[PDB]
Design an enzyme around this catalytic site. Structure first.
Site, short mmCIF file in Angstrom:
data_model
loop_
_atom_site.label_atom_id
_atom_site.label_comp_id
_atom_site.label_asym_id
_atom_site.label_seq_id
_atom_site.Cartn_x
_atom_site.Cartn_y
_atom_site.Cartn_z
N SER A 1 7.35 0.54 5.15
CA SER A 1 6.78 -0.38 4.17
C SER A 1 5.60 -1.13 4.77
O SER A 1 5.74 -1.86 5.74
CB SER A 1 7.84 -1.36 3.68
N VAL A 2 4.42 -0.94 4.18
CA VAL A 2 3.17 -1.47 4.71
C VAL A 2 2.49 -2.31 3.63
O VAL A 2 2.44 -1.91 2.46
CB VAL A 2 2.24 -0.35 5.21
N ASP B 1 0.64 6.82 13.72
CA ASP B 1 1.94 7.49 13.84
C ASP B 1 1.98 8.53 14.95
O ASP B 1 2.75 9.50 14.88
CB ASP B 1 2.35 8.12 12.50
N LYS C 1 3.13 -4.04 8.70
CA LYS C 1 4.23 -3.11 8.51
C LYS C 1 5.54 -3.81 8.86
O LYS C 1 5.69 -4.33 9.97
CB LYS C 1 4.05 -1.86 9.39
N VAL D 1 0.84 -1.20 0.00
CA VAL D 1 0.00 0.00 0.00
C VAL D 1 0.87 1.25 0.00
O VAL D 1 1.40 1.66 -1.04
CB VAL D 1 -0.97 0.02 1.20
C1 LIG Z 1 0.78 -1.28 9.81
C2 LIG Z 1 1.01 -0.14 10.73
C3 LIG Z 1 1.90 -0.28 11.77
C4 LIG Z 1 2.13 0.77 12.64
C5 LIG Z 1 1.46 1.94 12.43
C6 LIG Z 1 1.66 3.09 13.31
O1 LIG Z 1 0.78 3.93 13.40
N1 LIG Z 1 2.86 3.10 13.97
C7 LIG Z 1 2.93 3.96 15.05
C8 LIG Z 1 1.81 4.40 15.79
C9 LIG Z 1 2.35 5.23 16.75
O2 LIG Z 1 3.70 5.28 16.59
N2 LIG Z 1 4.07 4.48 15.51
C10 LIG Z 1 0.57 2.10 11.40
C11 LIG Z 1 0.35 1.05 10.54
C12 LIG Z 1 -0.60 1.29 9.50
C13 LIG Z 1 -0.26 1.96 8.35
N3 LIG Z 1 -1.10 2.25 7.35
C14 LIG Z 1 -2.35 1.83 7.55
C15 LIG Z 1 -2.77 1.15 8.66
C16 LIG Z 1 -1.90 0.86 9.67
N4 LIG Z 1 -4.13 0.87 8.53
C17 LIG Z 1 -4.58 1.37 7.33
O3 LIG Z 1 -5.71 1.31 6.88
N5 LIG Z 1 -3.48 1.95 6.75
C18 LIG Z 1 -3.48 2.61 5.47
C19 LIG Z 1 -4.86 2.55 4.88
C20 LIG Z 1 -2.50 1.93 4.54
C21 LIG Z 1 -3.08 4.05 5.66
#
Ligand SMILES: Cc1ccc(C(=O)Nc2ccon2)cc1-c1cnc2c(c1)[nH]c(=O)n2C(C)(C)C
Length: 330
Positions: free
Chosen positions: A28-29, A159, A44, A27
């Site tokens: 590294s994820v 994040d 991720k 979508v």
């Molecule tokens: C896999 C993952 C692992 C850690 C964090 C994260 O937020 N890490 C933090 C939190 C605080 O500090 N570090 C975010 C993700 C993640 C990324 N993109 C995502 C998602 C989850 N769910 C979704 O639907 N999407 C998209 C639609 C593709 C946008």
């Protein structure tokens, strides 16, 4: 005990995940299907988690943050795994969360939304921000690209607390002494973009950013100027010629009057006088969604590790302890 891992290369890197996660697509994820729960999940893979001390600390910080948050509007850890079965071979970290499917930037398409969709989207942001801030954590970089949204317009925050480039949503005190209301300023910039369909402050640099900000909210008075110690920061604000504060009723004309009043309370220059998440949730704008008994707070988050300078191997084993000790949520 230990599951079967299969290897597969995506995004020019080799992914190795348990067999329960199928149909990986970037979508590294990556987006993947969990055959155990039937859920669509987001996976991720941390890039070079222990390449440096900064990388090792951030790897530990991200894992500690996700394990702490258990909130509907805050992203949480469904699973965390590594193909290594010992600490010495440990050099990969995978994080599994809910998959909403898109961000707020994608589902908005730079279009105007109804007042109710704005009410619902902003309410979830503030509801999750209250939980995050109750744990004494600041997002610092709230923006549409880290707000995950599904086709039900449900929202989870991503994040948070990770960051310590264009900064269209950063509070004017981070650029140029700050509290949790730096995230509230980002909410105001986001909410303004949802209502009108354009970036509130499309600055081309940190000074152009400041000029667009000051043109809307006006040049500060003495009671705000006397709290800025930076002689350079005080210069840019005042040397930028006198600018009368705009009428928010005219900047956001046609919008719900209750929306405009909330924006004026969010986009306050003085962060000491800026509305907080809990106070914003009690604003009349969210009368259709506000419920004080369904806006819970978080347990205290142990942040003392942030003030420690450790070696890479120490951050790595601490990260390793957190992976082995993880308990999946109900
Ligand atoms: C896999 C993952 C692992 C850690 C964090 C994260 O937020 N890490 C933090 C939190 C605080 O500090 N570090 C975010 C993700 C993640 C990324 N993109 C995502 C998602 C989850 N769910 C979704 O639907 N999407 C998209 C639609 C593709 C946008």
């Amino acid at each position: 005990e230990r599951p079967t891992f299969y290897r597969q290369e995506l995004n020019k890197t080799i992914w190795e995940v348990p067999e329960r996660y199928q149909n990986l697509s970037p979508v590294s994820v990556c987006a993947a299907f969990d055959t155990k729960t039937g859920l669509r999940v987001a996976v991720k893979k941390l890039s070079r988690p222990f390449q440096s001390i900064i990388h090792a600390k951030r790897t530990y910080r991200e894992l500690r943050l996700l394990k702490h948050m258990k909130h509907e509007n805050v992203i949480g850890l469904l699973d965390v795994f590594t193909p290594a079965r010992s600490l010495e071979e440990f050099n990969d970290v995978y994080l599994v969360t809910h998959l909403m499917g898109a961000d707020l930037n994608n589902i908005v398409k730079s279009q105007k939304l109804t007042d109710d969709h704005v009410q619902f989207l902003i309410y979830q942001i503030l509801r999750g921000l209250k939980y995050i801030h109750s744990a004494d954590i600041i997002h610092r970089d709230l923006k549409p690209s880290n707000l995950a949204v599904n086709e039900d317009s449900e929202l989870k925050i991503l994040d948070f607390g990770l960051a310590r480039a264009t900064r269209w949503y950063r509070a004017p005190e981070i650029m140029l002494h700050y509290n949790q209301t730096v995230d509230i300023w980002s909410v105001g910039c986001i909410m303004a973009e949802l209502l009108t369909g354009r970036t509130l402050f499309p600055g081309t640099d940190h000074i152009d950013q400041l000029k667009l900000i000051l043109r809307l909210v006006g040049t500060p008075g003495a009671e705000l100027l006397k709290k800025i110690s930076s002689e350079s920061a005080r210069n840019y604000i005042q040397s930028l010629t006198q600018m009368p504060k705009m009428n928010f009723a005219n900047v956001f004309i046609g919008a719900n009057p209750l929306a405009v009043d909330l924006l004026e309370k969010m986009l306050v220059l003085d962060s000491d006088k800026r509305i907080t998440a809990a106070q914003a949730l009690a604003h009349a704008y969210f009368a259709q969604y506000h419920d004080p008994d369904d806006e819970p707070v978080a347990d205290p988050y142990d942040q003392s590790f942030e003030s420690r300078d450790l070696l890479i191997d120490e951050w790595k084993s601490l990260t390793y302890d957190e992976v082995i000790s993880f308990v999946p949520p109900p």
